[PDB]
Amino acid sequence: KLLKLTQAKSSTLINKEITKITQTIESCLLSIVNPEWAVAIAISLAQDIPEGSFKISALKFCLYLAERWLQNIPSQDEKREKAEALLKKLHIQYRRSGTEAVLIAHKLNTEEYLRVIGKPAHLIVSLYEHPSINQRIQNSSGTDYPDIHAAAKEIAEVNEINLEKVWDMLLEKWLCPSTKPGEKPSELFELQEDEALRRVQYLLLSRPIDYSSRMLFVFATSTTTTLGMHQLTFAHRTRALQCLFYLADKETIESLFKKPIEEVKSYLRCITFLASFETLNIPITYELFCSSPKEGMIKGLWKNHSHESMAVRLVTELCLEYKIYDLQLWNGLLQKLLGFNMIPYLRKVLKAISSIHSLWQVPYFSKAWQRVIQIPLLSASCPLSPDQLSDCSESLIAVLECPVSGDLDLIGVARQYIQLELPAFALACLMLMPHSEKRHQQIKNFLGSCDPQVILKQLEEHMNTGQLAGFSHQIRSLILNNIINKKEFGILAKTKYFQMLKMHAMNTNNITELVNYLANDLSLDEASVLITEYSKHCGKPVPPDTAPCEILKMFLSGLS
Amino acid sequence: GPEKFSGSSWIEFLNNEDDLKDIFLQLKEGNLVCAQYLWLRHRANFESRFDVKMLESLLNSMSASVSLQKLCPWFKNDVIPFVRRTVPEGQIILAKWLEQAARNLELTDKANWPENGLQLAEIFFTAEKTDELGLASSWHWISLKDYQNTEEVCQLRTLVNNLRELITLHRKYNCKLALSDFEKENTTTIVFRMFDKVLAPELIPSILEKFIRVYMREHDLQEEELLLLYIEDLLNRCSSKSTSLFETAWEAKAMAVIACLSDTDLIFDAVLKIMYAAVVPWSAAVEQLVKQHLEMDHPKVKLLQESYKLMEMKKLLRGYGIREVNLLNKEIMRVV
Amino acid sequence: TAIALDISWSPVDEILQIPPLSSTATLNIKVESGEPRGPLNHLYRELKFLLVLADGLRTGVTEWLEPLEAKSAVELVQEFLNDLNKLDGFGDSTKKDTEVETLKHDTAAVDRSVKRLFKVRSDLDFAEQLWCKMSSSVISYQDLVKCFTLIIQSLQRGDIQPWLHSGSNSLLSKLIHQSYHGTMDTVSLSGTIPVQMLLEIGLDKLKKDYISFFIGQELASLNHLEYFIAPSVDIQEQVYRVQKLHHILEILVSCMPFIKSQHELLFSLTQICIKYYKQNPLDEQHIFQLPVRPTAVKNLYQSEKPQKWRVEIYSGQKKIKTVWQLSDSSPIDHLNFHKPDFSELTLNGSLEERIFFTNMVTCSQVHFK
């Protein structure tokens, strides 16, 4: 039955039979007058028993028989040492088996975890470095994951080691890293992309929020940790406060700081800026903000620190929140961002200020739009990677999001898309011009040199997704209307769009030329069905069982 | 378009400032293309005014009559990401409506169900998280999980997983059930239902090996114990409500399950449980089964003969108008 | 029950023209109480009998209905028990019932098509079959006592094993269950208890009949009906929610012959009705406004003359307007223009004269400065 247990998927039927057999064996063994024989038999019996809770029970019964034999051994016999050396061996086996059972229960059968059982602290440290900890916070679809908290706690309980010391070491390891070069200011701005912050938050999840929130509050304010005497840098404060924002809600955060959530967010911005400056050794401190009302200090900071890119970013991100919108200040700000070639950051700043009328007339505003639109297009080339196509879509959105996009050279952007083999994207920019005659000339000259089927396929594949779905149908309406006006029905006739070219004749009431083309240059069945559908659509249905020639005759008489 | 151009409409649209009213009107018209275009042309206009009530108005103007092919891409990249980046507090109702909407696809559609239902239910979780655009000032740009672990979102996630497993059952295991059916059962009952969908006794073991045993070994389930429990449930669903003794559908289905057993201990007691539930006297197939099980040797065959004489005294009692089983001790003299 | 289609369009291309499919069409539906002229009559009558019991429990006075059959309730219960006892043993009597059925007119086809969706369920248990015989021939309080006493005797003697359905909201099913577990205590029949035990069966029967149609026709789900079939409320409010469900049934049946072509219309109307009664009580005076596709119902207003046709010419705001309207009936609720007196006038194969009422809404603009 034990051999069958090692292969059976379930054990609910074998557990009771094994329990009865083991109870019979235990009753036989407990009736033995000699306890030395009982120990020598039980240890041999338990060795053949495979791993599981049954092995743990067998080792526990071996421990009980060893205790009974020890009670029968006076302290003046050599059997005392022989019993104790065997009792500690049984304890070593018990602590091995208890850890092995917990590891197997959580589907952790790796050889490295089994080797580190003599070091319970190191095993627990390795447990909290599991990729599933990061996966739980990255993806939110929790159905089946190994519980590190349920595994490490039971392993520590079996090994009789306190989990508090291990958790204290883990808190020091990640939340307060030593000054070793692995830090860049880009990673500090986005700490959610770090596996250490996820592990810290996961560790703090198990303990009550009341204590963890206070501990994170102390880290974010004091200079010394609650774990020792180590100094607290501003990066540690930023990481601790972002953990607090993830675990504690608005009420818990506001109960500790005694400040509104906006003030806590401002403090988070300030400490993130200080951490970024400390990493690159920039002597800007916390005292630079708690004085000198914001207009004057912002202007002075821009005056003195207009040469550093991150100082420019500091001025830009403070002007957006504190609502200082001087025209010359923003003229300098937008120009310096492109001076450091921060094209996507400049795009984000422009789209953030694309709702204020005063900033729409900045001399660099339209200048900033043009280069931001074109530089990703100029850098891109065929074939188009998904990132490059997404950047082309971003440039088109920037064309859309720009309220003064009519002041931009859209023929140039369209020709850049032509160099990218994107006629649909080029026509999207061509259509958005405020001049009508030039737009009509350019569209007529362009659509006569590009295959409409390829343009429509590109519209279907990429233009109908994201935010461009509503404008793709209008580009399609322009293309189909031009096709009808140019008597170019034969281009799409062999493809799937001809029927679509049929229905656009329904909506725009441009069916006369399509009906004439179908009746003259093609079969009369498609013209008759087309006219029948048109009559059904307009509320004047043609009666059925009618010859196609007769239907064409009523349609022709209906156009007069 | 240019064919609808008019001065009265042009001036009225120019004087209109609440860009959401036109979007709501288009949603009520079933014209998703124009609603999406109005959403796109005014992205930064109502962005500064985005709050919960206007989102509720958007969901209410939303009707169950549009195609999801032009809607799911609009939710994945435009609507849900904008809600996540602007107001995470609106992630509850937006989920709740979706929790209804996917369930509505159970009634609106049956061919693409639940694949379309699955892809509409997962659109909340598969929506892009705004984490690449650089702006840390508006700290609500990161979709915190304080609103993703709520009861409504947790139920929606459970529904998404249920739809995944439902598609798995529809395609692989060929066990087609309703959503409410799958919402209230467990693995043992799913195993029972895979046999329930099967009516021919000959194909019970073939399908058992084909899919049912595969589902069994994928979840650490027991074979013979579950077969015996299926036999017990088949006995209970028929004999307990048996007003007419013609519901012999359990006998034919149970013989195949008996043939599927591999443990001799679990065959004799299963036949005994058939004996302890069937009305005395049994039918012809059950009579053949009893005579078969009397022929081979087993320690429980003595118990089987005890049950046989129990059947005999039940026959005597019910031929003398006493239908109670196992009268305790005091009515024996009265019966005599 | 007034079901009227209001069609609005702009601009007006022709005076008294056929509305196109670009118009906006809204169906205004008002549904009265009760439906004795439709396929739900044999339901509503039973519901009306339920309305007696739901009142008989409340006040104790039982205004019994007329017996629709020849036999009494006790005889039906006695023979129903006898046949089931024969089925359980010494018996299994078989009956042969052939009856003549025929059609009256081509509308009977649609009437039967609606009837089969509310047909009696193919699976009936002991409780619903008892209620069917007890919903038409119970005229006194002693009949309930006699019937329940016969049921008690049959259960105690262990003669039958009644067929049961899931849910078991009625206490009689629990009594049968305890009879399955040996012998039960003697059930007492005092006060309004016999009324309520029978009332508890009709609620389940009507709920199952409703669910077999809502889910059967894909018009509602269990969640959609959960608020109405929830047992958390008292039995009187359960009857009230059954009344609301029956009113929804009357709303749907009154519109089935019109919008049967589109499943979307029938589903949207059902959902609007469900959402209305989720948060509102039973209201028959309320007019449900369902926006419908003019394409699907274009054949209904191309064969009917409009009760009123109105052209409204305005500029900018609608404060200043000129309205020309033609109505076949009188549009004035305080005056009546003289129609010809149809006495000693045309009373032959010739059609009656009709005077159309034309009204011109004009105005005068005064500038206040």
UniProtKB/Swiss-Prot annotation, chain B:
It is found in: Cytoplasm; Nucleus; Chromosome, Centromere, Kinetochore; Cytoplasm, Cytoskeleton, Spindle. It comes from the Eukaryota. Interacts with ZW10; the interaction is required for stable association with the kinetochore. Component of the RZZ complex composed of KNTC1/ROD, ZW10 and ZWILCH; in the complex interacts directly with ZWILCH. The lineage of its organism: Eukaryota, Metazoa, Chordata, Craniata, Vertebrata. This is Kinetochore-associated protein 1. Essential component of the mitotic checkpoint, which prevents cells from prematurely exiting mitosis. Required for the assembly of the dynein-dynactin and MAD1-MAD2 complexes onto kinetochores. Its function related to the spindle assembly machinery is proposed to depend on its association in the mitotic RZZ complex. High expression in testis.
UniProtKB/Swiss-Prot annotation, chain C:
Its main location: nucleus. Keywords: Cell cycle, Cell division, Centromere, Chromosome, Kinetochore, Mitosis, Phosphoprotein. It comes from the Eukaryota. It is found in: Chromosome, Centromere, Kinetochore. The keyword Transport does not apply. GO terms for cellular component: cytosol; kinetochore; kinetochore microtubule; RZZ complex. Belongs to the ZWILCH family. ZWILCH gene is deleted in a patient suffering from colorectal cancer with chromosomal instability. This is Protein zwilch homolog. It comes from Homo sapiens (Human). The gene is ZWILCH.
